[PDB]
């Protein structure tokens, strides 16, 4: 039902989305290959096989400074897309500085890194751990 799932993998080509505050947002086509190192992205390469079927490779790319909500969301979105494509995608984790040759080959004039990105979707909270240790007096109470 998500609009971008409806568009994914319909014809041969490259599709790139960026994780933005727990959503999958398409990257403008003219910015393909310029990755924010503060962000995480999902990439679907669709290849037309000679037998008429579509072949799918799903890569989630993790910038060196991307936040935990972003890398977690990229991974989950990748699973959900693969499931939506009847499991037929092969999944690839791509870390900045260590990307696969096939991923790098998607970008004809070479992929490039830029600093920055979209802010984390997490709200910051201060966890209260309520598990107090027993006092002298409590220990004496249990003895009796």
């Amino acid at each position: 039902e998500h609009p971008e799932f409806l568009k994914a993998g319909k014809e041969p080509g490259l599709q790139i989305w960026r994780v933005e505050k727990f959503d999958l947002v398409p990257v403008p086509t003219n910015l393909y290959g310029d990755f924010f190192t503060g962000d995480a992205y999902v990439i679907l390469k669709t290849v037309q096989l000679r037998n008429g079927n579509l072949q799918y490779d799903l890569h989630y790319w993790l910038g060196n400074e991307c936040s935990q909500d972003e890398s977690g969301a990229a991974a989950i979105f990748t699973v959900q897309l693969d499931d939506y494509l009847n499991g037929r995608a092969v999944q690839h984790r791509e870390v900045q500085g260590f990307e696969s040759a096939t991923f790098l080959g998607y970008f004809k004039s070479g992929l490039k890194y830029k600093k920055g990105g979209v802010a984390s979707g997490f709200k910051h909270v201060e966890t209260q751990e309520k598990n107090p240790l027993p006092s002298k007096e409590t220990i004496e109470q249990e003895k009796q």
């Binding site: 039902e1 998500h2 799932f5 727990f22 959503d23 999958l24 995480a40 989630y60 993790l62 935990q68 909500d69 890398s71 977690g72 969301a73 990229a74 991974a75 989950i76 979105f77 990748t78 699973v79 959900q80 693969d82 499931d83 499991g87 999944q91 984790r93 984390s120 979707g121 997490f122 709200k123 910051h124 909270v125 966890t127 209260q128 751990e129 309520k130 598990n131 107090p132 240790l133 027993p134 006092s135 002298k136 007096e137 409590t138 220990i139 109470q141 249990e142 003895k143």
Partner: protein, 358 residues
């Protein structure tokens, strides 16, 4: 906004989807002299006896489990449950009837508008930004090795070990008692648990560390008891968690956690083993010992073929990794249609959980 409740043997971690951590962490206990739950049962334990509704990761007392959930909603999160979709967690291999019961209680007792159940280990892998890997999840009650491929656990390859935090606490108490000390109350177990959390560590080479403790005092540490007595902890510091690698320390014939990780990997298709070895993620409180990652790296390297790339990922936040994975999952724009709704429950009954929730 959605709620996330990660229920464990020892501790409940509860909060709101979208937050970077749980709002509240409290012991999974009900205490009676008509009853008290959680933090107040713990603090009033002088005049109560305690029961734990979750044993080795599985709910075994449904009436007390309902009290825990009531306390979570009303006392800790301070919400009206009828207003909030609720994501709960479950153990790997949780009995089918238990998943149905959880669903039934959420909709019929608490009248939630929507609910979902996810596997704890899988949430932890997602929190680490991975779809493929093998999780070592070790809490207070149970330890699992869970291999996962392209988002989903491989059930045939899961290993369960009933050696976890509580067993480690009891063993530390045994050997500290051998040193001359005495911990006669259940309340004092909580003190030994604290010693464990503050002073224990995993030795890189156990036999060398024993020799160091025998030839020097440099590994010794002091700990102050509630009555003011200061005690000394020596080789007990690393002998306690060594038990995870040598379960014979407490009479178990089981393989240690390094060998069960290897055994689990070897039950999977040879074509995915390389990705499993490169993506060993540790989660849960009992993986928190200093030195455990470096020890696991060494031991797994020793068992695997010598050209295998081995990597252990031990995030600092791993006490809450399960919870964080749930927070992320529940917040995704794509997750809106994956919840079990109250209408779906009314039409289908509890068995819906097996079709909507892997």
């Amino acid at each position: 906004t959605a709620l996330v409740c990660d229920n464990g043997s020892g501790l409940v971690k509860a909060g709101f989807a979208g937050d970077d951590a749980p709002r509240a962490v409290f012991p999974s206990i009900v205490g009676r002299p008509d009853s008290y739950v959680g933090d107040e049962a713990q603090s009033k334990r002088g005049i109560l006896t305690l029961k734990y509704p979750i044993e080795h990761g599985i709910i075994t007392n449904w009436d007390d489990m309902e009290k825990i959930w009531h306390h979570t909603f009303y006392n800790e999160l301070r919400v009206a449950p009828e207003e909030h979709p609720t994501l709960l967690t479950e153990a790997p291999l949780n009995p089918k009837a238990n998943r149905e019961k959880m669903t039934q209680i959420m909709f019929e007792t608490f009248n939630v508008p929507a609910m979902y159940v996810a596997i704890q280990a899988v949430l932890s892998l997602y929190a680490s930004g991975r779809t493929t890997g093998i999780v070592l999840d070790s809490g207070d009650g149970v330890t699992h090795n869970v291999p996962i491929y392209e988002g989903y656990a491989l059930p045939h390859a899961i290993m369960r070990l009933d050696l976890a935090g509580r067993d480690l606490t009891d063993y530390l108490m045994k050997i500290l008692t051998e040193r001359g000390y005495s911990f006669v109350t259940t309340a004092e177990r909580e003190i030994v648990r604290d010693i464990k959390e503050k002073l224990c560590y995993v030795a890189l080479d156990f036999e060398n560390e024993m020799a160091t403790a025998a030839s020097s005092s440099s590994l010794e540490k002091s700990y102050e008891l509630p009555d003011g007595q200061v005690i000394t902890i020596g080789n007990e510091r690393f002998r306690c968690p060594e038990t995870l690698f040598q379960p014979s320390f407490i009479g178990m014939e089981s393989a240690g956690i390094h060998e069960t990780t290897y055994n689990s990997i070897m039950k999977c298709d040879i074509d995915i083993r390389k990705d499993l070895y490169a993506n060993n993620v540790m989660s849960g409180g009992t993986t928190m010992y200093p030195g455990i990652a470096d020890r696991m790296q060494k031991e797994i390297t020793a068992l695997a073929p010598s050209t295998m790339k081995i990597k252990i990922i031990a995030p600092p936040e791993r006490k809450y990794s399960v919870w964080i994975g749930g927070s992320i999952l529940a917040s995704l724009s794509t997750f809106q249609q994956m919840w079990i709704t109250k209408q779906e429950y009314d039409e289908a009954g509890p068995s819906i959980v097996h079709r909507k929730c892997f």
